[PDB]
């Protein structure tokens, strides 16, 4: 126990906080900063253009989960919301194609757009601060070539595959200047939007607005924002010999190593460990190993859909939690 | 001045404070659980807990019962401010780590 989540063969134990005054006669762990300030730590294992791996150490499960939930469903992002079909003669229905376009993530920076006001008539609701216009004009024709008969439909037809990169940014008003240095493109240009045959045509434009993942998944900015408690493996008694090799084969390849000389198995990297509790089914390490999870050590893995950097996504989640707390504190309480 | 966001539920409120239910609209487990944890870290609070009465409503009732030291409203205010301070600590640590790397 004592901050360690118990991983048993049939159950998980000690999964709650127990860090408040009123848990015990010692009314300790009462809230104060300069204790959380000195305890809390951030360890960024890796940072990429789309994936961030960082540790939030000595923070509560509720706060970490609040960050995760806000990242998934409360950080705004830009996605197509309305699709206007001028012409679609493809085998894909208009609603299906509109849904696919909406699911296409756009490499357009949020905070460069303004939230659409729903209380406005449709002819004054969409402004150049509210909306991104994406056009798509693709027509299929037979290739004027003579390749082998009935080959793949890439040199057989022209524009047989419609990709997300065929979505063209159409600046409106002042967007010709503000977006000049950062033209809007799909974050994944090679998404297969549609396949179509000679004589078929797709002509549309899509209005892309800010939105919330809680409203629709297309607005979610993370392909997955998640955490995991840092695993803990305690070798209670030395394991050596062929038993050490058997014990080592019950974990992912680089989790625990075999010492040279002393010959005892030892925990080499518990961060690499997925908790399959495969050791807990063998009855020869039953009294030799204790599996656990550090309850206040969170290994966050944030992967961006493409619109913003994962560090920005996480910072926005923390900002959103703080801002909702602030707004609620400022709100007057009504009887 | 948002007079619809947070509401004291007078039916679920004790005389002279120290017990109250607050109805918060457009909020869910995200704020509810973090606020409940922070409030429970208040030594005067003897009962904190929230519930989303129905999934079909963007609504959240948070219950606070204290001892005689403070009122439920004061406990809620302290919890909200402490949540903000926690978020500031997290933001500062994350920013300094991002800058350093």
């Amino acid at each position: 126990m004592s901050n360690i989540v118990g991983i048993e063969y049939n159950r998980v134990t000690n999964t709650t906080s127990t860090d408040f005054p009123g848990f015990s006669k010692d009314a300790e762990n009462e809230w104060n900063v300069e204790k959380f300030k000195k305890d809390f730590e951030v360890n960024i294992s890796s940072l990429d253009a789309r994936e961030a791996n960082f540790d939030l150490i000595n923070i509560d499960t509720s706060i970490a989960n609040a960050f995760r939930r806000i990242m998934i469903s409360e950080v705004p992002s830009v996605a197509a919301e309305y699709v206007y079909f001028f012409n679609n003669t493809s085998v894909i229905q208009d609603e299906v194609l509109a849904h696919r376009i909406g699911l296409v993530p756009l490499k357009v920076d949020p905070d460069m757009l303004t939230w659409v006001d729903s209380n406005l008539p449709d002819d004054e609701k969409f402004t150049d601060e509210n909306t991104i216009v994406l056009s798509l004009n693709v027509k299929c024709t037979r290739n004027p070539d003579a390749p082998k008969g009935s080959t793949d439909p890439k040199e057989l037809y022209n524009n047989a595959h419609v990709y997300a990169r065929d979505l063209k940014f159409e600046p409106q008003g002042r967007q010709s200047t503000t977006f000049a240095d950062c033209p809007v493109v799909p974050a994944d240009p090679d998404i297969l939007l549609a396949k179509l045959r000679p004589g078929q045509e797709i002509s549309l434009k899509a209005h892309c607005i800010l939105g919330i993942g809680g409203d629709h998944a297309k607005f979610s900015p993370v392909s997955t924002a998640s955490y995991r408690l840092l695993p803990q493996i305690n070798i209670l008694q030395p394991i050596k010999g062929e038993s050490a090799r058997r014990f080592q084969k019950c974990f992912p390849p680089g989790v625990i190593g075999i010492d040279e000389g002393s010959d005892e198995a030892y925990v080499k990297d518990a961060r690499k460990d997925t908790v399959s509790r495969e050791v807990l089914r063998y009855e020869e390490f039953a009294d030799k190993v204790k599996l656990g999870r550090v309850r206040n050590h969170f290994i966050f893995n944030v992967e961006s859909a493409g619109a913003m950097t994962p560090e920005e996504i996480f910072f926005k989640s923390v900002r959103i939690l703080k801002n909702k707390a602030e707004y609620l504190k400022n709100c007057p309480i009504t009887q | 001045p948002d007079r619809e966001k947070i509401k004291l539920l007078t039916q679920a409120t004790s005389e002279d404070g120290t017990s109250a239910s607050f109805q918060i609209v457009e909020e869910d487990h995200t704020l509810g659980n973090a606020l409940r944890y922070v409030i429970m870290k208040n030594p005067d609070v003897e009962f904190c807990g929230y519930s989303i009465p129905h999934p079909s409503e963007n609504l959240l009732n948070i219950r606070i019962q204290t001892y005689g030291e403070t009122t439920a409203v004061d406990a809620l205010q302290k919890g909200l401010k402490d949540l903000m301070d926690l978020c500031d600590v997290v933001e500062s640590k994350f920013t300094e780590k991002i800058k350093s790397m």
Binding site: L47, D48, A49, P76, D109, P110, D111, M112, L113, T114, W115, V116, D117, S118, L210, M308, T309, E311, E312, F315, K316, R319, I320, N323, Y327 | T95, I98, K99, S100, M101
Partner: peptide
């Protein structure tokens, strides 16, 4: 990476619609 964008970019999208 390792460069702040929240500091330099004003977050407009975070305002309540």
């Amino acid at each position: 990476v390792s460069r702040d964008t929240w500091n330099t970019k004003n977050m407009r999208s975070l305002e309540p619609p």
